[PDB]
Ligand SMILES: [Zn+2]
């Protein structure tokens with residue numbers, strides 16, 4: 083439990099910050115920065131798309147994966163010349179689902 | 191297995207044992223040193239002038255052919271006598287090997 | 290005879306190599322990086338201690354008296370200071386494999402004295 | 407109880423004999439038997455006891 | 456390590472070979488297509504790639 | 520084929536003093552199975568059975 | 570097995586080894602370099618040029634001639650390289666692509682020595698003193714092992730081991 | 740056989756901690772940095788390592804180790820899962836804050852007495868009422884987590900009966916006792 087809690091609380095954020103910002107250029111050029119993770123409680127989305135809280139026994143019975151969605155704040159800055167830059171922050175971009183350890187701090 | 195009295199007398203069995211077991215000079219050498227000892231008449235090692243002079247105060251070899259570099263090897267009594275080995279034999283083996 | 294040391298060039302701190310002054314028949318120590326030369330004080334250039342006879346009392350350090358995992362004795366008092374208690378232990382260096390010889394170190398603070406019986 | 411007492415006496419004796427051999431090794435009184443390093447003679451003797 | 460090199464003059468790949476003349480402490484690199492040759496002092500640590508690097512450096516030194 | 524090794528520095532276990540070549544230190548179990556082993560005797564007998 | 574405190578890269582392993590007149594020569598297996606480098610060349614590439622200054626990182630008490638005799642064959646072997654730029658060139662000639670200019674080979678060697686060799690000691694510029702001391706400690710440990718003054722390490726000893734749990738594994 | 744293993748009952752595995760509080764304490768406690776020393780200082784000083792980095796040297800390692808232990812036993816700037824090993828013969832102090840070390844709680848012994856006293860048991864016997872916990876027992880400096888690498892330096896009583904006076908004293912300088 084402690085090892086999983088350290089992974090969610092500290093290690094994911096470090097890995098997201100340690101990755102180099104990515105530059106793109108054709109000239110006009112773009113760079114993106116990943117700055118802050120968020121993890122919800124485990125949730126499942128039905129065939130109609132509505133989120134609801136998935137309990138572990140439902141995951142065992144329906145053969146679901148007990149997991150939570152991970153989000154990251156992304157900043158994009160646009161560069162070309164004259165410092166005519168602008169920044170767009172795409173807050174809470176959904177990045178994927180993380181399997182949750184049962185009875186961990188992030189389990190229901 | 192041994193023949194004759196060498197099968198009863200432990201000292202003769204040990205003599206054959208020494209005749210079989212490989213002994214190199216390292217097994218019987220305590221230390222070695224290299225010196226700049228340019229005149230055997232006044233050896234830079236002090237402890238051995240008394241014998242060294244006896245070899246050079248006779249004509250069999252010429253100091254004009256002597257290289258000034260000395261190799262000095264110290265042997266130890268226990269390993270020599272455990273093998274009944276003599277320095278005359280060691281010198282004979284050296285001169286057999288290098289001429 | 291004891292090992293022969295390294296010695297260093299005064300002008301450039303690289304190590305000096307022995308060479309003879311052929312026309313003068315004296316031993317130099319000479320640099321290979323610069324023209325410095327010196328006369329040798331010891332005529333021994335190489336020593337090989339094949340028996341590897343070395344005194345463990347040089348390798349022992351007094352701080353070992355602080356080790357709580359070492360045995361302590363009152364039967365072998367310190368000659369240098371009369372203190373009753375010493376730690377004792379066997380030789381640690383390898384190749385001296387055979388001897389079970391004990392070495393003692395005084396436990397009195399600032400008496401780093403070490404001996405063998 | 408007699409058997410247990412004789413067993414305990416034999417063990418106590420063997421432990422004192424090992425202490426004696428250890429003291430002889432520490433004092434360098436223990437002499438190597440032929441063909442064996444002093445460590446191996448000590449081990450042979452303790453295992454014998 | 457690689458022991459055959461692209462010629463700096465004629466751009467043919469794997470066209471240069473190194474001869475380590477240890478006894479004279481000199482190394483010769485020669486191109487088989489254009490027969491441009493270069494000689495450099497070599498040490499016992501020196502290897503074909505050090506001779507090639509010396510040749511490329513001498514070429515860039517001549518461009519100055 | 521040898522007595523219990525010094526897997527700790529000069530020790531079989533941190534319960535013994537260094538350079539203890541004595542019987543208990545090196546794994547002589549002096550108890551019987553009816554008396555039951557002491558904790559160090561137990562662990563050395565597990566080392567043997569392994 | 571060097572790993573930076575934050576896992577920005579995987580571990581990189583440095584080996585310093587003593588090879589089996591003939592004498593005991595010490596060499597380094599550095600990462601991204603195709604050939605073992607004499608340790609004294611690695612020290613010169615880190616900018617320690619005189620033999621004394623190098624040995625001051627390897628032999629902390631000079632009144633110990635048995636260690637001096639054991640480093641001496643390596644001071645002999647590297648004596649042909651005496652300046653930092655020649656040492657960085659020597660290292661960069663290896664691993665780098667053969668055709669690149671002198672500046673790129675020097676830069677490649679500096680990049681390996683900063684970022685790939687001993688990253689746990691530092692990946693910054695001006696870390697060369699820290700790196701020289703730790704690489705000197707590695708050679709010193711090797712000398713103590715060769716002289717039998719310190720026991721070889723046990724791969725079974727659980728102090729020398731780590732358990733990767735669910736967190737590190739994920 | 741032997742390749743698959745199972746944890747002992749009280750075994751804990753370290754989760755990992757950042758070393759910077761310790762480096763900051765050491766620089767405030769007479770450690771000398773490698774960039775500042777002259778090499779001649781190293782022969783009689785102690786090398787200090789933190790997570791394997793040789794960070795400095797120190798000239799009085801006994802008082803440093805006493806201070807470091809006194810910090811760990813107080814839940815101070817050194818967390819309970821930090822290992823601190825002095826090699827007295829090699830003159831090395833090695834400090835570990837990394838993950839994956841296997842460790843276990845031991846009782847502290849001083850002057851051949853347990854630091855655990857009746858007042859602790861009497862507080863633990865009403866744990867459901869007084870909210871006194873194992874964590875309070877560690878915070879009182881009575882229990883210490885010791886790793887395998889630190890056990891090499893520890894002297895363990897198997898029971899408090901080893902602490903008693905005896906007709907021949909096997910050891911008189913125990914540091915810890917098994918629970
Ligand atoms: Zn010079």
Ligand SMILES: [Zn+2]
Pocket residue numbers: 367368369370371372395396397400401402
């Ligand atoms: Zn004293």
Ligand SMILES: [Zn+2]
Pocket residue numbers: 462463464465466467470486487488489490491
């Ligand atoms: Zn060409």
